[model samples]
Target chain A: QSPAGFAEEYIIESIWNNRFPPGTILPAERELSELIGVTRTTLREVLQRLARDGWLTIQHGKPTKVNNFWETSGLNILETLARLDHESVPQLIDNLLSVRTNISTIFIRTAFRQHPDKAQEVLATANEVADHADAFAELDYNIFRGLAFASGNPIYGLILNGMKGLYTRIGRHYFANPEARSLALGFYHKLSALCSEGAHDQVYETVRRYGHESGEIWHRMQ
Target chain B: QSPAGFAEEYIIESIWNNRFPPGTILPAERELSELIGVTRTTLREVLQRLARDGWLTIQHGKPTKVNNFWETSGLNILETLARLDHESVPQLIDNLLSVRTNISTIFIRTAFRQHPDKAQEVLATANEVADHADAFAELDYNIFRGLAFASGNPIYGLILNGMKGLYTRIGRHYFANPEARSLALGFYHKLSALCSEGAHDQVYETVRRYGHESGEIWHRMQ
Candidate 1:
């Protein structure tokens, strides 16, 4: 790994572990540079980027302050937070699942309302999804991506892409359980039928129920 | 501005203006740094940051490549794009308002369902808002922030914070129009009344209508 990249990850881990908690002043440049085994110039560059990313606050002369990233940062940090092998991972996973459920309902309803045929076409293949865990995860993820496009909102697709790294990681774990895989297959069938039958109003309720069930299964697994 | 900051903005503007179009290979480090009146060290730091932000791609033994950021980037870039004086601003504004409307409906429905009293208290101050643009903008923004919290979803609140800079700018313009302000006031009152009556179903429809009308108003101004 590049010296800068390694330094970046080390600092992030330190913050996540609360080795450098929120509102704590960072060590002096020389001290931190030597401690991280990066040159002062390299450390400064990384710090500037971290400050821009809302992880720290750097001003004219004052020592850098670690930010309470949970309160101050945006969804940009979500992917990184998910990859950390920390106790917070489970709660973060729950939050992500809930948000996905809400967002899925939105795009699915809109996609079915505007282009039922398109939505139907995408979900039509759900019944034939491979039984393999990785394959199931990939297919399930793509269904939502397809639905986002069918919804005619490019923004939704971009969001799905942003969470791609995190989703791919957790999805494999979620689908590994046979019951979880079976449960999602049932949802796909039900959702496909609803769209095919032009039941727009029922789409939201159906997805909500399945979303709740999926969350429970995931929590149990964790 | 710091030399690196200046160079970063220069490159961004160049990309937006098509001087450094997507897939275009950036000039050699020496030439570009001299052209932007920055030392090679400063320019490289700026380039690294941009690459991290998804604006450019760097590879060993190859020149940096500009990205088609619109398709690849997440909500992180929305604030920066909105600040640029480009023709894409109107469409970007439209997309943002649409997403906000969808997200608002989700949180408002959930907030009202889960904590009707809290949602009511937040919207209760809506009727007494002062007849001023900036004040109205802040109040309106806070209402969504409050609703996100009431929804029991920290992720929603973080999403709001992510778009804070852009929302603040466009919101002032949005509420500046008397009709827009009056329209939102009516919405606040209607929403407050519905929550008071424990009507969660209607909350979704109410926000959707207002969201659409606000989009039209914003587009007309552009």
Candidate 2:
């Protein structure tokens, strides 16, 4: 890969890994080029790609900065899917569910291990909002979204925000059941504890089981 | 709502729905004003919003036309999320899963009952791609995405597409497992049959259950 390619990949990896906080201004092109061993021309191309992809912004004569991933409009794709008819949606739902389950397990496990304090904060928030179904639901969303933000990954939070409209619409239905809501909170409590203890594997399994059990419950309701 | 609001809603809804097939020319503002019982000012506002949102282009003394949804810079939201760290991604995934499971059920059930032919088409596609894991996965995505498109609503499809990159990444992880591939196909088969039979309620239940189950599987893998 060219220096530009390497730089782009490095930046992408860093952002994905939450290496830098959201809104962190990246080093100047000259600095980045030096660090990544890429020429300025190659570095500029990589930065442009990131900017086009909504990952970073490089204003003329200004230092490159991470783009507000949450602000991008590309996140509305799922909202579009929600408008489809019943027959057509199930397949997409299946695919989406599979992806969500896998990614969440990976992320949650990592977050819990790397940032136990944040995990506790999320658990506390979940418990605080548990009394009111609607408030709890929003808090539940916040816990996840907040965790994504804290993870130092801008993309995760950005995509979640893009799907916010669709998420809230569906949450209104599933979380309406007080029992489901409580169960979710229970799962969160366990998740927090596991994270605090740095039980990476265990935390992954817990979330995996919770996701399946929750799916079964919701399925029965449907 | 005023004519402007109605027009804006209509256009926004249209873009959200992907109603104006790509490259379709929108009716002239003056013509639309007459057709939809709105004044030119109202129509202009609608057109302006569409243009600003990257859904349409209006040149001086030229007719407005729809832009390809994929062509917009807004599509990058999913790319950003896919690159997020594992820990921060769970909350967003959870939110997405919750919302997707619920709304997808409602839409799938309605489509099965109201449009059997369309339902059958979606099911057939699922069957066709099931054997070829890669092809099947894309087709699987389209099943729900297509149905969303059929719903005469754009929000559903857009939201699904917004997460396209994330879903694609997840699919790459599971396609390597033949067992997982088979299980996925089986889910699609069952879902297709229900939709074909016009079992709206069953279709809804199946999709939602599938989501939860799939989530469980992902968690297990992690």
Candidate 3:
């Protein structure tokens, strides 16, 4: 099959390569038109698509500027997903799981290595709330969230933060069992230890196992 | 503490519960100030924070309305995570792994049960690209992405779409060993089978294991 459409590839490359930094001004429409070697109409259409997708902004007469691409494009995609019907939801869930699993795993492992002390903090937080049955779930959320901030990966953190409500809802359904909460607490303690040692390999393994075990339980619940 | 402070909680709850659908007009500052018993200045500050975080739109004198909450809020969070310093990245990776592995496992199991035929299609795509050594990676991405869409969950599809670039970059780093890619292809085949058979439990287990094993490899690479 042919590569992604030229317009799509152009925008992807432009944003991915940081051809236009956020807020950087771009050439006039006529210039961009010539540069990409597409017709003015085609170029304009591409630019418009990018703008709608949050890559560039075109003021009527002002120069176009690069945008904060991730926010705009990411949200547009997410909003579209949220509006889809239930029949198609499962595959969407699987794809989301794949992306989330891949990105999140890398993000957390990195977080643990950089912030061992904060990992301790997460452990302490988990311990303090372990007995507060009603609060354990949010506490679990906070533990991961605190680490998100500590890891300093703002994009992953933002994704996590934006999904906070959805996560909370999931917790309500899946974490209702005290035993499950305790298992999570235990997992966090192990996770914190791995972080403390800067054992990213171990941390990754621990989290991976934990994730699977948790998934097993969640699937059973469903 | 007291529910994310009243003003913050109100907005958050509204969005989470879909009380204020995207584009719904929010109560005016004066009205919200009166209803929530906060001062107008405080209300405006809260509104400003929300707007900055991509929750609301408040033009100079016009009544505010909900912004596309997902885009603004989601992008803000992603930007925050992406900008984290290198030192803190491992922990972020760990957290990422934790969430992603669990979410994907659960999603795939449920999704496959609901759409066996789509699962078969995904399997076929995986097999088709399994041998294309040079282009296998992109083909693999398409298969999983297509599967995500077929699972019929917009959120999953959108999240995957947003992360496609990141995945390609990361996949390139770790899948340098052709053997690793082949092993992963095998796992994909197995996963496809589970999906086709609607073996929800088995599929969840397989994906969870796959995530864990892959995460371990990625962590070691880092």
Candidate 4:
């Protein structure tokens, strides 16, 4: 790892290598500086950013301890993790599909619940996107973004944006599958119809159908 | 607001006040450093962190533009937003509760579906945490964490961890009412009983009830 690149990549490489496991405090800076082949000044700069990223806990006058990235990391960390792992793309894709299906169902119902008048319009919009594979990923993102906006709550949008890195990547693969495109087009049409009809049964069933199809594709790819 | 803090507070404060509104190309670095009363050196550090946190978009040889925090910022930014609003605690509480109820239900169900043997144990854990308010907040965080672990998806846990700042605060308030304890106990007992029996109905039934009760409490407090 380069001594430069802001030392983030090097430190993350060290952590990923388990050089400092969670709960393990690192050796004194002066000693570790030689170990990592960087000055204490550079180490301090790197450690500060790692702490902000929730990778380390740097208490004054105390040795810095590793944090459980799995337990504490934000989605930005997820982006970093995926960036370093090309092989896990399919697995990451599967996880994103599951989360989208799980969360979007409630908020979609919410949008239509609060803005019943916009239901048909939104559904028609969904139907319009079925023909575009190159734009499938972008289109998929918008449907959820629109739903979150309609949920009368803004937090959902932020959550979706947090997942943008993985979702957009996974989304490209999802739509590229010609069969996946057919699945989404038909599923969305059904969802739009259900929302338009204001069906008595929760649309969770339809959402699950969509999630499973998307999820199955990735898992199978994995 | 001190310059020693490196203009982060000032920048965020300005965005909140609509001074450097979203989509505004922040005045150039040398100019902005003077305007915000910080050295260019400090200003670049501040901007890097803000861009990392999704408060701005910085590109080499291009303008640094503010991002729509509502649409782009992640949970760390959410932490800052809640921090600056003393009067918005209850509103923050409502949003957090809604989010918690919305998410934990799926993963809890997922956990059970994947690890049915652990169901009774998780339920018992939930039953044990009802005795205190402060700990009640922390415990809910764990129960959901445990469920996310069980869900076999690492993303849910990351999502929950992302909300840790806001969740504990809302959890404290959600348990503040004398009746809050009753609501939780009865709700948890019913949920535990349902899970124990491998109950047939959707866990969303349990989740919505909890979410609404928690959200209602916060809204009522407002």
Candidate 5:
């Protein structure tokens, strides 16, 4: 990071971590520059970047005001918040599982309804990564990701991709369990065949079961 | 827009809408300056902003290339795509309904489970929004969003917030029907009373029914 990048992140964490009270306007620029040990030019550049990214509001001479980062900044901020926050982590992980199930259910249902041929192709391709747990962990992500792409909504792809890093990091903990890995392997293989045969209803249930059974296994592993 | 801001969005839409071919290296800076009618300085500023937002790679000596925008950009890109590309809007709206149903179900479930006190408070407050169709439309969003916030994952709030505009836009279309408006009103009131009495199981099914019923209403409005 440049000195400005370092300054930007420092101010970000300070605002998030220190819990700046209900008052909206932050301390003025000179006050901020002195505290961060950066000059006004450097601090202004950092503040402009934050404002551009929806982290705060900035004008030429007024005190900078932070936006409701949760209500306004996009999903990218959610990634940053989870890192700065430890209290929200465990529940965040479980919520990740449930949200994935929610979207993946639609992913599978839509893929079959809209793109069965491509859907089978993705399911079959997933077998290419079945040799080990780490590979399976990533490939599991790809399955849902590919399904999102196939589901005909690139929004899902964007949302899932925003989450890809966190899922891969936390997912390893669950996939490393032999039982969890084997369970996913069986379901993927079954889904591949069921989908290939055009068994959309059966395939939908298999995916649902994948969500229910795997989430429990993931919860237990946690 | 500032010259740089215009340049940034132009390059962003080109990468997404134009496909930008398979090989790396966005067109040379001199070439883009001429094409965008901006000087090199303005174009460079835009490129730097794009790199900062993870839209493309930039290096001192290496070629710049766009990342998979749909696969890498945050949920914010979903909004951008809808604006720049007309074809993606309808499908994106329907899929939003499904995804909301998926997350809101869990939001309601978790809210009652973890924070009955706050959950009931939210349910009771929802009655204030029941007077009319537009009123209920926003209230419905608040119900789920409040539940998600109370459910312990602000990621849900972020995702919910990302969809908030699109939801309200289409939500009005659905709720404009008096029958649909009346339906939601009844349920919101019933939910407040049932939830106030500490009825978790009953609350779960009610919220689930709302998802099922709301999604169907949303679907039929199309």
Candidate 6:
């Protein structure tokens, strides 16, 4: 890792470990730089980045304070928290999947409702999705990505891309089971047929139920 | 604005104007920093920040390339885009409210189902919400924030805080209309009663309907 990367990891890990608890001021910059074994330049960059991501609140002439990140941090911090905290990973993944259930349902419903052709173009490939786990996972992600972009809502696409990391990690495991892949194939076929028939309501409910069941499967795998 | 802040706006505006179109390489470091009236240090910091937020791709030996931000950027870019683009603000706010409806419904449903007491503490304040628009808006935001925190899902809180900026702006306008405020007052009261009765299904349906109607109201206001 680069110096700034190392400093970020060190600081976030300290926060995670509560060595620097929320609302507490940090040591002065010079002292902290030495302590973290980074040059002042890299340390400043790291601190600015942390503050931008809501991990810290920089006070001019006052020591920086850690934020109550759970209450204040934006979605940007989700990637960092997932990447750095092993203990919280499974729970975070659980929440990610849960949110995905709602958000993806909205994506599918919106796309199928207004732009069935765009959604159909993506869903048409479902019939050819290979039986392999890796192939199933890739196609599943691509399906959502396509639906998000096709939904005519840039916000959905941006949010989906924002979540690509955790989704990527979870997708591999979720699709690894042959039974899981079979279940997903069934979902895709049903969704594709519903899209063909212009069944927006059923599309929404199907996606919702699939996501809920997938979460259950993930829990069992864990 | 600070130098890094200035560089960020200049670059984002340039991208917005297509002066630095997607896939185009940025000018060499020395030339671009001088053009933007920032020092190399500040310019580098700004570039790192932009790249972090999915605005640019930094190449080791080649110049940085601008991204198709609408397709690739994370939710982090939503704040900047909403702030900088007047033409897109109303539409973005529309989408924001639409997403908020679904998300807030989920937050309320999850909280009431699993921890009604915590949600009840927040909803209990609904009866005392004054008729004033600004007060109503503030209280409304606080209600969702409280429910988000109470939902036992840090992800919900983080996402809600992530959206606070645009919500603050739209809330002012959305609450100014007497009918809008009356509608919201009705929502809060019904939701409170439902929570008290532990009507999780009704609570979910009520919130979903309110959100859908709220979006329609927002659309009409725009």
lDDT of 6: 0.80
Residue B28 accuracy (lDDT) in model 4: 82
lDDT of 4 by residue, A25-82 (tens): 8667787677777876567656656776788887755778888788777776777878
**Could you tell me how far off, in angstroms, the CA of residue A145 lies in candidate 4 after the best superposition?**
2.0
Per-model DockQ against the true two-chain complex: 0.51, 0.05, 0.12, 0.60, 0.44, 0.63
- The number of residue pairs in model 3 that clash at the backbone is 47
Rank by TM-score, descending?
Answer: 6, 4, 1, 5, 3, 2
Instruction: Identify the CAPRI category of the predicted complex in candidate 6.
Output: medium
- The runs of at least 3 residues in candidate 3 whose Cα sits more than 4 Å from the true structure, single-residue gaps closed, are A1-157, A160-222, B1-84, B130-136
lDDT of candidate model 5 versus the reference: 0.73
Fnat (0 to 1) per candidate: 0.57, 0.09, 0.24, 0.63, 0.55, 0.66
A-chain TM-score, model 5 = 0.83
lDDT of 6 by residue, B1-222 (tens): 677778999999989889899878877889989899999888887887788777898865677899988655776777788877888888898787777777777778888887888988887787787887788788888888888877778777777776776776688878998888888888888877888887877866787788888878878878
Better of 2 and 5 by lDDT: 5
Give the per-residue lDDT of model 2 (tens digit) for B155-203: 4455556556566556555455666667777876786778666666677
Q: What lDDT tens digits, residue by residue, belong to model 3 across residues A47-93?
A: 65465455777666688888755333553443233333456544444
Give the docking tier of candidate 2.
Answer: incorrect
Tell me each candidate's TM-score. 0.81, 0.39, 0.44, 0.85, 0.80, 0.90
* Two-way TM-score contest, 1 vs 2, winner: 1
Q: How far is candidate 4 from the true structure (C-alpha RMSD, Å)?
A: 3.4
lDDT of each: 0.81, 0.61, 0.61, 0.74, 0.73, 0.80
lDDT tens readout by residue for model 1, B1-222: 888779999998888889899778888889899899999889878887787677888886687899977545666677778667667777767766777788888888888888888888888878688997898888888888778878877677767766666676788988899998899889888988888888888988899999988878887887
Tens digits of lDDT, candidate 5, B129-181: 65666787788777777777877666677777767777777767788887777
lDDT of 4 by residue, B65-178 (tens): 998887677766666878778787556656766877888888878776777666556556765664667877787777677677667888887888778888777667666676
lDDT minimum window of 10 residues, candidate 6 chain B? B70-79
In the predicted model 5, the residue pairs found to clash are none
Which has the higher lDDT value, candidate number 3 or candidate number 5?
A: 5
Off by over 4 Å in 2: A1-75, A88-97, B1-222
